[PDB]
């Protein structure tokens, strides 16, 4: 026998959405109140921080989670989209690895765009 199998991979074109150097705007303009770090530490709650996702999240509570997978579980309707994502907050007052949400994009109701050219 052997011990090697099972594998897959498939991605799509993706370089960048155009942009200058340095940044025409910091992702830490100010965010929430963000007041902690040896100056104003009330509790051991989560503090304002931004991970791989520039999108900064406002302080939260420990053992909580700022998940927002889709607006409503309609399944076949016009959504509003409110920056879906899924981030949990440890009981130590920390965020997770990095927000994520791919169980929303895929829905049993979508299939448009294609176009093509023929002689």
UniProtKB/Swiss-Prot annotation:
It is found in: Cell membrane. It comes from the Eukaryota. Disulfide bonds join 46-89, 70-104. A N-glycosylation site within the signal peptide impedes its proper cleavage and function. Belongs to the G-protein coupled receptor 2 family. G-protein coupled receptor for CRH (corticotropin-releasing factor), UCN (urocortin), UCN2 and UCN3. Has high affinity for UCN. Ligand binding causes a conformation change that triggers signaling via guanine nucleotide-binding proteins (G proteins) and down-stream effectors, such as adenylate cyclase. Promotes the activation of adenylate cyclase, leading to increased intracellular cAMP levels. This is Corticotropin-releasing factor receptor 2. It comes from Mus musculus.
